[PDB]
């Protein structure tokens with residue numbers, strides 16, 4: 773069902789995450805971690821203290837789909853054992869030093885063709901698929917986008933609900 777999922781999304785904040793490659797989303801799904809540019813890291817740290825849930829919605833560039841979504845379970849931290857991210861052409865590993873712990877809520881994909889009716893007021897009401905890495909998605913758009921994903925029956929939201 774969808775009732776526990778709606779409870780987790782209640783009064784959440786939502787951020788679009790754009791990855792240049794599938795390898796980093798696969799690593800994030802396996803290890804429960806994410807890293808982003810410092811500008812976005814500052815935004816996520818602010819949001820994590822401000823809201824009951826901060827939701828990251830993942831899209832690999834050029835894939836035409838979202839690959840799932842996850843809830844922040846910590847602010848960023850540095851100095852842990854380094855994660856072997858695949859780094860884009862012109863950026864170093866010091867940029868992605870801040871590591872967030874995340875709990876996956878859905879590891880299933882959603883094609884952009886299924887979200888074409890949802891627009892993001894915080895990006896000029898462009899379709900929600902459009903936006904830079906770190907773009908915040910307004911509450912109603914973000915909630916409806918998450919509810920479009922196929923249910924992930926492998927995930928038990930009971931443990932996430934406790935962290936809230």
Ligand SMILES: CNC(=O)c1cc(-c2ccco2)[nH]n1
Pocket residue numbers: 790791792796806807808809857858860868905
């Ligand atoms: C593990 N984290 C990443 O792979 C990543 C990449 C980017 C990015 C922003 C702009 C171009 O690439 N943001 N996060």
